[PDB]
Every structure is written in C-alpha cells, then in structure tokens.
Design an enzyme around this catalytic site. Sequence first.
Site, PDB file in Angstrom:
ATOM      1  N   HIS B  61       0.833  -1.215   0.000  1.00  0.00           N
ATOM      2  CA  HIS B  61       0.000   0.000   0.000  1.00  0.00           C
ATOM      3  C   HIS B  61       0.861   1.256   0.000  1.00  0.00           C
ATOM      4  O   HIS B  61       0.460   2.268  -0.551  1.00  0.00           O
ATOM      5  CB  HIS B  61      -0.903   0.076   1.233  1.00  0.00           C
ATOM      6  CG  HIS B  61      -1.717  -1.151   1.485  1.00  0.00           C
ATOM      7  ND1 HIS B  61      -1.494  -1.978   2.558  1.00  0.00           N
ATOM      8  CD2 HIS B  61      -2.760  -1.683   0.799  1.00  0.00           C
ATOM      9  CE1 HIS B  61      -2.366  -2.977   2.534  1.00  0.00           C
ATOM     10  NE2 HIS B  61      -3.139  -2.824   1.474  1.00  0.00           N
ATOM     11  N   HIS B  86       5.442   7.304   6.153  1.00  0.00           N
ATOM     12  CA  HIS B  86       5.162   6.574   4.923  1.00  0.00           C
ATOM     13  C   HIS B  86       4.677   7.578   3.854  1.00  0.00           C
ATOM     14  O   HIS B  86       4.602   8.800   4.096  1.00  0.00           O
ATOM     15  CB  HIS B  86       4.092   5.525   5.180  1.00  0.00           C
ATOM     16  CG  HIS B  86       2.807   6.114   5.701  1.00  0.00           C
ATOM     17  ND1 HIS B  86       2.517   6.221   7.041  1.00  0.00           N
ATOM     18  CD2 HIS B  86       1.743   6.640   5.053  1.00  0.00           C
ATOM     19  CE1 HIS B  86       1.329   6.774   7.196  1.00  0.00           C
ATOM     20  NE2 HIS B  86       0.839   7.046   6.003  1.00  0.00           N
ATOM     21  N   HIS B  88       2.194   8.644   0.173  1.00  0.00           N
ATOM     22  CA  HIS B  88       1.066   8.564  -0.726  1.00  0.00           C
ATOM     23  C   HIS B  88       1.333   9.390  -1.973  1.00  0.00           C
ATOM     24  O   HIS B  88       2.012  10.422  -1.934  1.00  0.00           O
ATOM     25  CB  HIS B  88      -0.190   9.067  -0.054  1.00  0.00           C
ATOM     26  CG  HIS B  88      -0.592   8.277   1.147  1.00  0.00           C
ATOM     27  ND1 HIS B  88      -1.491   7.232   1.083  1.00  0.00           N
ATOM     28  CD2 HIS B  88      -0.210   8.376   2.446  1.00  0.00           C
ATOM     29  CE1 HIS B  88      -1.665   6.735   2.297  1.00  0.00           C
ATOM     30  NE2 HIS B  88      -0.892   7.405   3.137  1.00  0.00           N
ATOM     31  N   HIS B 105       3.379  11.158   5.417  1.00  0.00           N
ATOM     32  CA  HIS B 105       2.709  11.082   6.689  1.00  0.00           C
ATOM     33  C   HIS B 105       3.648  10.616   7.782  1.00  0.00           C
ATOM     34  O   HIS B 105       4.282   9.570   7.695  1.00  0.00           O
ATOM     35  CB  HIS B 105       1.479  10.183   6.598  1.00  0.00           C
ATOM     36  CG  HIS B 105       0.348  10.807   5.855  1.00  0.00           C
ATOM     37  ND1 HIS B 105      -0.724  10.079   5.393  1.00  0.00           N
ATOM     38  CD2 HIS B 105       0.127  12.090   5.485  1.00  0.00           C
ATOM     39  CE1 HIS B 105      -1.575  10.895   4.788  1.00  0.00           C
ATOM     40  NE2 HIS B 105      -1.074  12.113   4.816  1.00  0.00           N
ATOM     41  N   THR B 171      -6.337   7.353   7.246  1.00  0.00           N
ATOM     42  CA  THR B 171      -6.777   7.417   5.858  1.00  0.00           C
ATOM     43  C   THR B 171      -6.829   6.018   5.221  1.00  0.00           C
ATOM     44  O   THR B 171      -7.096   5.872   4.027  1.00  0.00           O
ATOM     45  CB  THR B 171      -5.865   8.350   5.064  1.00  0.00           C
ATOM     46  OG1 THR B 171      -4.521   7.859   5.077  1.00  0.00           O
ATOM     47  CG2 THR B 171      -5.916   9.789   5.689  1.00  0.00           C
ATOM     48  N   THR B 172      -6.587   4.997   6.040  1.00  0.00           N
ATOM     49  CA  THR B 172      -6.654   3.596   5.614  1.00  0.00           C
ATOM     50  C   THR B 172      -7.485   2.828   6.588  1.00  0.00           C
ATOM     51  O   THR B 172      -7.645   3.256   7.720  1.00  0.00           O
ATOM     52  CB  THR B 172      -5.289   2.920   5.599  1.00  0.00           C
ATOM     53  OG1 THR B 172      -4.726   2.967   6.911  1.00  0.00           O
ATOM     54  CG2 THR B 172      -4.374   3.633   4.703  1.00  0.00           C
TER      55      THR B 172
HETATM   56 ZN   LIG Z   1      -0.958   7.825   5.422  1.00  0.00          ZN
END
Ligand SMILES: [Zn+2]
Lengths: 222, 222
Positions: B61, B86, B88, B105, B171-172
Amino acid sequence: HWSYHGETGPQHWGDLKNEYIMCKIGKNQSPVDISRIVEAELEKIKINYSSGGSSITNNGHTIKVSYEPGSYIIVDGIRFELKQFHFHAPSEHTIKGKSYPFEAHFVHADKDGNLAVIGVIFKEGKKNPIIEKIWENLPEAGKTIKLAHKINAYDLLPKKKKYYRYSGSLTTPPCSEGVRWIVMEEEMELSKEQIEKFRKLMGGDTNRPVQPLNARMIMEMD
Amino acid sequence: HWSYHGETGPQHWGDLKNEYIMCKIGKNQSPVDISRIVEAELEKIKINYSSGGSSITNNGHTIKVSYEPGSYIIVDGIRFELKQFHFHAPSEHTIKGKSYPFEAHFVHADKDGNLAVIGVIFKEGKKNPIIEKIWENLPEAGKTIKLAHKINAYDLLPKKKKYYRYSGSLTTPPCSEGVRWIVMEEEMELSKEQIEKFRKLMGGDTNRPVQPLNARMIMEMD
Ligand SMILES: [Zn+2]
Ligand SMILES: [Zn+2]
C-alpha cells in the site's frame, strides 16, 4: 429504550441497539467539558427567529417545545431551520469544569438534515418569564400540549452571543456525530424553583456524562 | 485485503469487514479538502527528532520507514512518539482544491495509543536527497530492510512549520477516528522520477478520496 439510570444508562447506550453504536465507539461525542480552548476568528452567527413555539411535549426524557417552520440560523453559509428546543438539568456541558444547574438546546436542521445545536447554560437567578410560560403548560409523560400564545426562542438566548464551537454529536441516542455545536458563553437565568419543578417532573438527573475531547479543540470567538 | 482500486477500493472499505465500519458511517474522516479555514491562535508544535529511521517496508500500500523510539512531538501538552513515516501519491489532502503529486505522513502515538499525524506535501522539483536514500534500497514486496545509516525524519519536514490542524481519522482501514491531523502549509520537493518510481511500485494512486468536513472547521495557525 434508553434512560439516564441503570440498565439503560449512558455507559450502556452503545449496546442497547445496533443503531446506538456511535454512543460506544465514536470519538467526537457530546457533551464535553469546554477545556481545550483556542481563540479563533469565528463569525457572528446570524439568527432569524420568530414566535413559533407552538406545542409542548413531555417524552419523559425532557420537556420539548416544537417549532413551526420559518425560524433559522446561518452557520458556514448554510441555513439551518430551528426544529425544536429542549432542556437538561444539570447542564450537559461543563465549562472549565464548571457545572450549571440547567441547559437549553436549540436544535436546527438544514435541507440535507444536518444538525446544528445551540447550547445555552443557566444559573440560579430571577424567575424566568419564558420558562414560566412553558412550565405553566407542562404535560405528563407521553402527552403534548398546543399553545394559543406561541413562544419565541430568541428570548431564551443570552443578549451577548459570544460562543464556543466544536464538532460533536447528539447527546441522546443514537448519538450521531457530525453535529455543529454552538455553545453561548454568557449565562442565562431561571429560578431555583423553576429548576426543581423540572427535575421532579423527570425523576432525577437528565444529563449525559461529559465525553472525552480526544483530538478536538474547542474554538472560542475572538 | 483492502486496496486503492476496484471492489476492495475506498468506496467499498466500510463494507468489507465490520472492523472497518467507521470508514462508511464516520463523519470526522480524513483526508479532507482544506477549505473551511479559520484563523486560530494555535501553539507552535515542539519537535524533538533524532536520526532514528532504521528500516524500510513495502506492505504493498505504501513505503514505510520504521522509526526507533526516542523521537516525539508535543501536542496539547501530550508527548506523541514518532513511530513511522510513509507515503502517498498523489496527495491525500488538498489545499483550497489544489492536489499535490506526493505526500508524507508522520505517524505518532502517545501512552494510550492516541495518534497524531503530521502531513507534508511535496511538489515537483529537483531530486530529494532524503527520498533518494530511501529509494535506492527499497525492499522486495512484503519484506523489510535495515538501513545501516539512520534517516532523520526532521529533514523531510519543511523549514517553516506553520500548519493547519483538525480532528480526523486514519486514511486507511480501519479508518479509526480520534486522530490529530497537523498539515504543514509549506510544500516540500522531490523529483518527477522519484514520484514515478513510487507510483509504478505501488501500482497507481495511493490516496483516499477527500471526505466531507461535515461539522468541522480547519484551524490555521496565526
Ligand atoms: Zn498515510
Ligand atoms: Zn439536548
């Protein structure tokens, strides 16, 4: 079927029905303790009320005055019509720890059904004339009473409208979040006698315990 | 198995497992379009980072840099330890409608597991030196890589730490609410190819669609 005591009390609302799940898992619940405060440049809330308090109800949980359409407030450029207003005692919100003997909630909803609630806190003081009108025509559990001389909710609001704002929930099941809370800073007044009549009529406390702020801040008008 | 595409995609997350229910019923979700802004006297966030970026992960992810304990931020007088950061692509958050090609993030946690995340947005520019260190030794899918030279997350944060703040969620999945979001205004930089490597490696977009603000406001530090 919820109440403020025992098997159906606040700590159990989340488990009574599947619809009440947010009462247990939500992280943006009301009431709260107005404590984590930050000054923020909020706009004055435009209010357009009219005498629309047409009927008075006792659902055993509160005394609710139903409002006929036409009265509203503007929050975030959105018009929320005043649908009803009711009372809790003692206050549901506490301010900097302080608990008040009485609280009024003015519940509004816009075209899409989103709620905005005005919270007004009371202290002991002079007999309140508006409350006295409502108290005079106070029905028994399950019963409703229509009013020939309609009540205006604007008169229960303090004259100074400086407010706190935060994102929270309904304070009774289903405790749905996404409710805009507008809490007036200035305290209103009603008599000790007026408060006591209310409490007796209900059978005790009618407030939900304050809920954790968690990630939220309370904003205060500049 | 949840993903960013199809029937296991973002509009479907809330329906997959009961553990993911807040993703569908939640009213305080992230990311959001940073639009409803209000100036607030927010405190400057105190940061104490050290070179602690020990390992790199590919969970399919995102690319996760795990952080050794010892680095933290202070929010609301609470110490939130940095656990990881991590990525995005494109940005999960948008500012005034504007989307960025890449977002970072930094996930922190306090004593009790309450999360506070710092978000940093990137625009296209020259090669980012810190991203490069990470990019030149990505793991094989699902596995991990100890780094031999520790990464400092501080160098991924902008020089100006002026920020938006609000109450949101992961957000996951499971999209848990009660998350403190701190989004830096100043945009950082990385290269168009550094962005593309990340995208090809992930298999496309790795952002959740923006969620409605509902009752919330975004606070901006004064
Ligand atoms: Zn995130
Ligand atoms: Zn109420």
